[PDB]
Amino acid sequence: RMKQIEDKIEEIESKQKKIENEIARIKKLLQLTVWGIKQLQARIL
């Protein structure tokens, strides 16, 4: 039962790292879209 607890926490930790990596990707793409909107407003203005 103690091994199951340890393994569960391992699985949670690996998954949290994947979530963190995905958040990092999301922030970068979000910043691209900010920049993209900025360029389009400046072209139309």
Q: How far is the CB of 31 from a second copy (least distance, A)?
A: 9
Kindly state the tokens that stand for 19.
Answer: 């979530």
The backbone torsions φ and ψ at residue 7, rounded to the nearest 5 degrees and listed phi first, read -70, -45
Q: How far is the CB of 8 from a second copy (least distance, A)?
A: 5
Q: How far is the CB of 11 from a second copy (least distance, A)?
A: 8
Q: Quick one: the chain helix, strand, coil %, rounded to 5?
A: 95, 0, 5
Point out which residues bind a second copy (CB under 8 A).
1-2, 5-6, 8-9, 12-13, 15-16, 19-20, 22-23, 26-27, 29-30, 33-34, 36-37, 40-41, 43-44
